[PDB]
């Protein structure tokens, strides 16, 4: 079992290391998104 195909390279980026957040909605399926819902504000703490 040799690596015949798909020798993909892996790069690393530190531009958004401290600014990248992951938001997951446990009650919202992936089919319906909040793209059309107009947002108003977001409160946050560092």
């Amino acid at each position: 079992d040799d690596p015949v195909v798909q020798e993909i390279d892996v790069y690393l980026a530190k531009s958004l290391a401290e600014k990248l957040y992951l938001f997951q909605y446990p009650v919202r399926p992936a089919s319906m998104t909040y793209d059309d819902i107009p947002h108003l504000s977001a409160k946050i703490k560092p």
């Binding site: 079992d1 690596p3 892996v10 790069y11 997951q24 909605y25 919202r28 399926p29 089919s31 560092p46």
Partner: protein
């Protein structure tokens, strides 16, 4: 009735309760259809081990944890797809294996929350997350090596 706001069935994979009228994939075939069948980019969420096979470069140390926050930019490893469905990640002298994670069906939005100013910041929706990968050390090879 509005078509994009119907009631949702309990099964997130079969929310189509009313209509107008999935086999478990593998990482090798996943990447094959992501690159050969189509050319559109995709956002993935892979889980790396606690410690990477490296040393913090001039980070003031101790054999501590070496995560991505210590490594620099550029090429850090290669992704190999062998025969019979093997998907490995060569991160130097060692080789980890990549498997499919838990098949999430709920909405996962990868966004960028950049606090450019101490009073006002920007939230940038980068994309959507659909598949999850898991990278694990090939302990069998590490044991048979020495």
């Amino acid at each position: 009735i509005i078509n994009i706001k119907k009631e949702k069935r309990e099964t997130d994979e079969e929310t189509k309760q009313i209509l107008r009228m999935l086999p478990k994939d593998v990482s090798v075939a996943e990447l094959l259809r992501e690159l050969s069948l189509t050319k559109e980019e995709e956002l993935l969420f892979l889980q790396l081990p606690d410690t990477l096979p490296g040393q913090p470069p001039t980070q003031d140390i101790a054999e501590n944890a070496c995560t991505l926050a210590d490594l620099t930019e550029g090429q850090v490893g290669k992704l190999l797809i062998r025969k019979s469905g093997r998907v490995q990640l060569l991160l130097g002298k060692v080789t980890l294996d990549v498997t499919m994670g838990t098949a999430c069906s709920f909405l996962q939005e990868l966004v960028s929350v950049g606090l450019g100013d101490s009073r006002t910041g920007e939230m940038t929706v980068l994309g959507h997350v659909k598949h999850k990968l898991v990278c694990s050390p090939d302990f069998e090879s590490l044991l048979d090596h020495k």
